[PDB]
């Protein structure tokens, strides 16, 4: 496959049930995973979730990611607290309130500068998809991001293709849709910065991934794992991790 | 007597029912309030929360607040979007990941500088309370905040005493506990900036406030209203507003 190390990311934004979380991490801690894969849990600070996660999470293949970073103080605070991954949900921020492509690019470049691994979420809206503007839209986003990055910075970067219309809607991208978007994203990185880097970049798919559909998505040449919301708050997440083999 | 205008603030962080919100604001829009009180709703941009609120909210005594501001761009963006109040959950940020007192002070000073009204949340952890360190801890936080403020800036500032151990836990501060903390806060302000300013400052209580317990809390000499999470996502919030008479 010569695929790089896959990633399986649990997006725990705004979760309600905190006893539920502790149990989840218990399950994760005891889950034997038989292949090379980076697992990520991205709890909110909201309630005890992030603090508890930091405390209880012990599985060697898991790291903790934060939801968004702004100013280097917040970043430095995160470093201090022991968190070194960040998820930037640009796809959504752009969609819901028009966050700028340059803003996320600045965020990425800054987070990387402070030595974070960064999961950058890019994607088109339902509108844009129907219009046939996926490629234009996605290419614009990756282009903006790349502008602010040196070749070596890509080692600290992970891209998540996360079409907004697929987020929490039950509407999953078909394998062909994901594969096209990922291929498209990689090709731009190859062009801009080199086939070597482009090859090492993980591009994760996000949006209504579950244990039933994960395996077939991962089979796609340019899919390197998943960003998972709803299905990551369930024992099902384990199936998703294993779909990345 | 002579309390300044009370505030009733609905903290809608990370809420998980969107149709539920629209209905809430409908109820608020039609709610007749028979006294002078500033109401505040603090929706997340997450989902349509904030954008919908901006669109549907019409009640004359309500304003919209944002959850946290960083860099003057984000602030300017907020001004542009028509939002001019901010809630800074320092109590929590400090507790969950160790946010610095000086960081929140800088945030306050900056938000005020951009012409925002600021609700600064300060408070001690369960640990600090049990240890008997409430006063030390709370005083340290207000002190930090004050260092970055000129006398005139206090007109743009609102303090919320929000003990972390009372947040979303069902454990409400007793009236005496809230009264002590508020009195302590006000007496510092009186000393280090003046009785006049100290007299005008609203100090809100936050942490497991509901319709049953609000009235008795508000009766306390130094309580100027409430920061409400869970109970602010229910029709109950109306009872809380009326408890402020």
Swiss-Prot record, chains A, B:
What positions does the entry give for substrate binding? 11, 13
Q: Which UniProt keywords apply?
A: Gluconeogenesis, Glycolysis, Glycosome, Isomerase, Peroxisome
Drop me one GO molecular function for this one: triose-phosphate isomerase activity
Could you mention a single GO BP entry for this protein? glycolytic process
Tell me the superkingdom of the source: Eukaryota
- Please give the chief subcellular localization of this protein: other
- Name any GO cellular component annotation: cytoplasm
Give the enzyme's EC designation. 5.3.1.1
The active site is formed by 90 (electrophile), 162 (proton acceptor)
What does it catalyze?
Answer: D-glyceraldehyde 3-phosphate = dihydroxyacetone phosphate
Pathway(s) served:
Carbohydrate biosynthesis; gluconeogenesis; Carbohydrate degradation; glycolysis; D-glyceraldehyde 3-phosphate from glycerone phosphate: step 1/1
Localization terms from the record: Glycosome
Give the enzyme class. isomerase
Q: Which InterPro entries match?
A: Aldolase_TIM, TIM_sf, TrioseP_Isoase_bac/euk, Triosephosphate_isomerase, Triosephosphate_isomerase_AS
- Self-association state and partner proteins as the record states: Homodimer.
Other remarks on this protein: The enzyme contains a high proportion of positively-charged residues in beta-barrels V and VII (compared to the homologous regions in other triose isomerase sequences). Since 2 clusters of positive charges located at precise distances on the molecular surface are common to 4 glycosomal enzymes, it has been speculated that this might represent a signal for entry into glycosomes.
Q: Which family does it belong to?
A: Belongs to the triosephosphate isomerase family.
- This protein is called Triosephosphate isomerase, glycosomal
Lineage, uppermost ranks: Eukaryota, Discoba, Euglenozoa, Kinetoplastea, Metakinetoplastina
